[PDB]
Write a protein that binds this DNA or RNA. Sequence first.
RNA 1: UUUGCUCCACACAAUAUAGAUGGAUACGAAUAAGGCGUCCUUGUGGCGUCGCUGAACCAUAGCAGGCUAGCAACGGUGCACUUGGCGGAAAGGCCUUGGGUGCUUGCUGGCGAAUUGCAAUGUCAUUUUGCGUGGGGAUAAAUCAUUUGUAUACGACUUAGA
RNA 2: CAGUCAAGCGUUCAUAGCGACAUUGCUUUUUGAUUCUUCGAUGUCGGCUCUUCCUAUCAUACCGAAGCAGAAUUCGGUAAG
RNA 3: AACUGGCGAUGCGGGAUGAACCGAACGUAGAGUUAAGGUGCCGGAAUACACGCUCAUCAGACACCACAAAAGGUGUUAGUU
Lengths: 136, 106, 290, 171, 197, 191
Amino acid sequence: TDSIVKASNWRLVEVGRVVLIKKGQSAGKLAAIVEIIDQKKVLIDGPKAGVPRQAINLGQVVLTPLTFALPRGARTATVSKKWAAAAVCEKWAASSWAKKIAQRERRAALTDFERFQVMVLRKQKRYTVKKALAKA
Amino acid sequence: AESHRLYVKGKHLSYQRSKRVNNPNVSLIKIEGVATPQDAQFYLGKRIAYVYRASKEVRGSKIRVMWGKVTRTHGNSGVVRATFRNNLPAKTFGASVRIFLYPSNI
Amino acid sequence: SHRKYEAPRHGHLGFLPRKRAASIRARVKAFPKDDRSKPVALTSFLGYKAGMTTIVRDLDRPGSKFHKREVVEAVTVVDTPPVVVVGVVGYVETPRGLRSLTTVWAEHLSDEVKRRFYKNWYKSKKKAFTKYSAKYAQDGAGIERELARIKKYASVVRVLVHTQIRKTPLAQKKAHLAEIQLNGGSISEKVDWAREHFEKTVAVDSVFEQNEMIDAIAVTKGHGFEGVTHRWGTKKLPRKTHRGLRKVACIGAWHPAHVMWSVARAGQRGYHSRTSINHKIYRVGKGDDE
Amino acid sequence: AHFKEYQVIGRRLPTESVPEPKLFRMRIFASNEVIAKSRYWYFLQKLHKVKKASGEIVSINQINEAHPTKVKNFGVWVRYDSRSGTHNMYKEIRDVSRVAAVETLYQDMAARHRARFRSIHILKVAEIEKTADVKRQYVKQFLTKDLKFPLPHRVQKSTKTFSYKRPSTFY
Amino acid sequence: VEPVVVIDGKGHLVGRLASVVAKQLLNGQKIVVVRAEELNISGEFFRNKLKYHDFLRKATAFNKTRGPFHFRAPSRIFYKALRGMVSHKTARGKAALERLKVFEGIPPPYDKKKRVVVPQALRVLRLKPGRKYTTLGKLSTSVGWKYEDVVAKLEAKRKVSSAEYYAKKRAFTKKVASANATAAESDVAKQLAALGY
Amino acid sequence: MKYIQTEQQIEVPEGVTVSIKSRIVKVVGPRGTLTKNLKHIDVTFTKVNNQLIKVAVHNGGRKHVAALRTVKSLVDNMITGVTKGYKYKMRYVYAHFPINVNIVEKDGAKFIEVRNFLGDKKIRNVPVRDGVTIEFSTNVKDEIVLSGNSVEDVSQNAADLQQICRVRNKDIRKFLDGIYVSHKGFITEDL
RNA sequence: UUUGCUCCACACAAUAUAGAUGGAUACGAAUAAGGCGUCCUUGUGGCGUCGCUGAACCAUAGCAGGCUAGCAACGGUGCACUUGGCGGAAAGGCCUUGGGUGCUUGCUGGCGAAUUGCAAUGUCAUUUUGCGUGGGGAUAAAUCAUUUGUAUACGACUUAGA
RNA sequence: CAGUCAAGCGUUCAUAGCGACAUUGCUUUUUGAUUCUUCGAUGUCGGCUCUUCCUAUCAUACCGAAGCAGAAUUCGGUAAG
RNA sequence: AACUGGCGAUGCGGGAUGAACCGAACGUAGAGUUAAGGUGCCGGAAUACACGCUCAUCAGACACCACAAAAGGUGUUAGUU
């Protein structure tokens, strides 16, 4: 019998780990971790996404599930080449995490008219779905 | 439908004060949903009304009002400074206030 | 400065205040711990202190100088006619203690127990439990509901009993009503036993037996306002003391600038609730015999 | 403020017998130019018979980090005054700039030895990017090939006083 | 700003929670706090036990019935923590304290209602991992609280009744998901997706 | 210092299988089961090759890394427990009064009873643990054996035999009487 | 002891709201871990997927929400009722099977609103009272004084007394 | 009233117990020093009586040490119940 | 005793509290900035940001100021040879 151990593998910070900048000038952009500086700071770059290469605390970004093969210490030019070929920008967009951010922003931009359009559509959808439960 | 609010929910927190001296002529007001000074700038200059009831009907109403305005922000946490036509009684610390959407800019 | 010579304090600081007890009947503050293994039984009983006498018995103490020798002992004779089980009380355990959920009473209550519900019994209409007793006398209309409310709740059950004061020579003629906790069996049997024994008397020979250490809860003999000399046992001041010698000389230092709670003061003596422990049942005697 | 690396070139005042004095230069980390020129006279008063009144500052310039986005190993040699005496230490720290390592250095010196800026002299800030020149194990551990670690027990900041579900510290 | 905010004290630090609640009560927010026994204090049990023994020492010397009243229940210890953060001797302070209720476990009016947490006061967010901490129930028992065992049985009861409701809740919600799956591919749902929903 | 990573490797024998939920380890072998609640160190467990388990501490201080080795060491003891068991043998040392040790079963609780320790009338009772078995070996007198899966219980029992037999009010350099553990080995070492 | 008292429902009510203005919207445990879905070993596993805040979710249109009229629906919601239960920690509230009764903005119409004059909270949710209204409901005690001595300075207490 | 150092004592061993030459303190249960308060007055010595507090523990609980082989001591710890 | 600044003769903000300390000296009001001091709650103001260090079975927590020392501790951290 195999020595069962709960796998418990989770989001290690490493060169090439893509992160989301949650506070600052970027505030919601992607940037690959370029080179580890310390336990709590690291060099990051977001050239395709739009983040300048900089030192930053790990508490100023949130790590993401995704990463790609990026050699340590690569400048903005090599990072953008590996970022494009990996489609890490696209994979982030297709992820559920980004869809909630996009849904959040799209809902916030809704005008008063568009909010009223939501209200009618939500009543319509509720009518059919509530009917659907009742029959089965 | 059942909701008919056009104002914002607000709390009368206290007079402007130091540790031991207070200035009743200025009231500190919390705005619901405002936690930063930047969001409080939207409400600057907006009319405020403390609405209260009295047992004696005065001019066809048992509801009396004191009016005021949001003059500036206070602190780092979205509280604002407010002055009223008559200063608030100070038994209304923690009481509810209504911040209206006028005078409007949007 | 320190007292010149040490001495123990006069009196017990755990029997405070020395005040009149709230009632003449001393209640059981703590009933025995419940054992679910043992059968249902009463844990207390009510009787009346009649007086004292003297007895002779042979001492059995293998190692004493009076071993197998006769001794004379002072004894207390407690007049104990049987108690009438009338009513039960259920107690659900809460994070605020035991709370009485309900009290279920018996079909019929005698004049003695109903006298406890009046201060002027003679000029009254004797309207006590009359409309309550209309709830009885059916199969389960309202009878069993209270019982089952106690069964599914009420982790502690205590029967209500009263003394047959009319059987004693006292002129009181008004019964003493008190709770007695059942501490045997399960909860249901406690409610069942209470139900079966409702309105019928419980004899002392079914609760306490010979050679058994029991406790007695009573209110001590009252003595009124007492000076410190006999209330607390303090030393009498010398004969030549100006303006009184049955006193405490110094009732406190300059500081704290107050009289302390611990200093002996004149006050009420006697008439206190007391729970004395470890009294041996030398004899349980019947009244229907010479 | 943010430490800036200043170059300060000064000299003793030119007299008649000695025109063109010897033009000493220092690299001193300071908040601003006023503190830069002040720190210059403090040290130049320590190494030469000259004070501010008897000399002049001929050039004050900012030195920028050559590449502010490459992380390097900085060898820092420092002397400082504790309550009892004076001690020279060699510390070292990762950074991307000379200045932010010096900002780091003053933070560490304050934290570990209670040394205020008044008490610290920065003897020499040296950069090395070649390993085996790195002596401190608290820096060597970030140089292992293929470094990767988690950030366990992630505590997420809350904007509102109340939340409606127990937090998760997963990452 | 809710009419009443009900917080469960489980896994919360007594001081920080008392600070947050006291500010809310002063600003006019009625608050009730439940699970007072599962509240936390930083420091080992011996530390916080000694501190309450130090508090127990203090009593009026000439009459102990007027001195500090050392309440042993975990709810009253939190209440003491909060009352120290309120100007309780003024009329405004009495009003703020009235707006607060503290309980051990969850009494009936609140185990059907929502419970929130205060991330500022949560132990798993505040204390550095590995740091010893004290649970309020154990501390209160040690200094003379009598109802830890009673609450545990009544909390076990409430939880097991609360487990059935959630399994019922999961039963009711899955019928929506599978019925909505058949009422899916609707133009209304597509239109809402384009409009942020 | 806050070392970024430290690891220790456990090596499980071919017949033992370790189960590790959140911080509960369940070592099962021929001699049965052994469990441990270990929720007070904040460690991690990793499976490698069905014969290797790696226990790691991330960003640990000095005290944290020290507790990592203990957690490793405890798990060998359970692995050693089911594979071999832990056997402790004591010896009753006495100058004048023989020490009378037997095993009593009151309500089937299996107490250790010691009589006549320095001729005193006080009778020492030591409850045994569940998972340790009392044995009185022949081929050598004045010796008590007890084997068990958990080293913790067998050694705590053994200490409890020592504890009740401390000599009071006397120079204990001279009055050496007692029951001292002499062997701490395995039941089936190299067998 | 000149119609007293109780429950409930209405036409009118007070020292007033420590402060309404859509909704306090229920797992538990862990946090060096969990939630949900699914598969399978007469059982504490495998495979998916979510989190990274409630910026959510319900409820949300109509004279503060009117008068009405139709449709491819057999739903949803309020109310006077009804049948079964559940809930004692402070339960005093939760689920209910049946009928009636409205509404329904799920979709489509007709009519109304205006002058509160360019804002004025522009007034929409109870405690208690009357020789109040009317549908019910079972018609007591304490205290003084007298008395007692298990009590007692006086009060207080323990008793008795048609 | 405690501590640090340890030359020495302790039979051939500093430290079981002590401990010089030095030196660091603590306390306000001594007495000085001072004159702040009180001279339109705070009743002063001692004893008696009575309560509480402190611990720098004489006794009683448990224990560590010894120049503790038993008895008796001595040193120390938690401890003012 | 010296020089100066103060209190006496002086409120006000701060040091909880206080003649003298810090800030600032005062007609009656209004608005805006500040000083010293602060910003978890009492209490106005960041449960802010950043790096470390510390776990105390008497932690520490802000000048005057309401005290602590010598001597020690593979407790922990950094540094020197």
